[PDB]
Design an enzyme around this catalytic site. Structure first.
Site, PDB file in Angstrom:
ATOM      1  CD  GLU A  35       3.553  -1.744   0.561  1.00 39.40           C
ATOM      2  OE1 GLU A  35       2.721  -1.461  -0.309  1.00 39.40           O
ATOM      3  OE2 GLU A  35       3.526  -2.829   1.217  1.00 39.40           O
ATOM      4  CG  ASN A  46      -6.549  -2.421  -1.084  1.00 37.27           C
ATOM      5  OD1 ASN A  46      -6.446  -1.816  -0.007  1.00 37.27           O
ATOM      6  ND2 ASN A  46      -5.508  -2.696  -1.840  1.00 37.27           N
ATOM      7  CG  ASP A  48     -10.980  -4.713   0.840  1.00 36.23           C
ATOM      8  OD1 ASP A  48     -10.586  -3.651   0.327  1.00 36.23           O
ATOM      9  OD2 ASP A  48     -10.664  -5.065   1.989  1.00 36.23           O
ATOM     10  CB  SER A  50      -9.850  -1.140   2.153  1.00 33.50           C
ATOM     11  OG  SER A  50      -8.976  -2.064   1.550  1.00 33.50           O
ATOM     12  CG  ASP A  52      -3.306  -0.325   0.397  1.00 38.04           C
ATOM     13  OD1 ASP A  52      -4.044  -0.692   1.298  1.00 38.04           O
ATOM     14  OD2 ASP A  52      -2.859  -1.087  -0.462  1.00 38.04           O
ATOM     15  CG  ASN A  59      -5.277  -1.861   5.422  1.00 38.40           C
ATOM     16  OD1 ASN A  59      -4.382  -2.674   5.646  1.00 38.40           O
ATOM     17  ND2 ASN A  59      -6.372  -1.739   6.150  1.00 38.40           N
TER      18      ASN A  59
END
Ligand code: NA
Length: 129
Positions: A35, A46, A48, A50, A52, A59
């Protein structure tokens, strides 16, 4: 902060993540590796809109507030910035809520794709725990 492998394994164990919801410590270390490469300051935007955040790339769609994810929740009741701290307490506390949500560690797409079913004990091999 960029943790060492065994340094992060120790911090995770101390915060009670070892065998949390039945996931051995190497599962959590393996997820953190893919990650964030063990970097608390890791961020990823992201498609969309959002973001992380942190060692486990938690997220903003569900888990933290960053003020810029329309329609989102803050189920961990933290600013997303708390997930970038050198102190992993917020990341661990929020990971516990995520992994309790129904799909276990599949919540982390990188865990499903790169850790799930592998010899995850290799991630804690040689560590003094
Ligand atoms: Na949010």
């Amino acid at each position: 902060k960029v943790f060492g492998r065994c340094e992060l394994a120790a911090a995770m164990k101390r915060h009670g993540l070892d065998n949390y919801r039945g996931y051995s410590l190497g599962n959590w270390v393996c997820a953190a590796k893919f990650e964030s490469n063990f970097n608390t300051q890791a961020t990823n935007r992201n498609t969309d809109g959002s973001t992380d955040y942190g060692i486990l790339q938690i997220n903003s769609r569900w888990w933290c507030n960053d003020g810029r994810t329309p329609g989102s929740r803050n189920l961990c009741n933290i600013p997303c910035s708390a997930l970038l701290s050198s102190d992993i307490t917020a990341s661990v506390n929020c990971a516990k809520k995520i992994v309790s949500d129904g799909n276990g560690m599949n919540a982390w797409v990188a865990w499903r794709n790169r850790c799930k079913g592998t010899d995850v004990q290799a991630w804690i091999r040689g560590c003094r725990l």
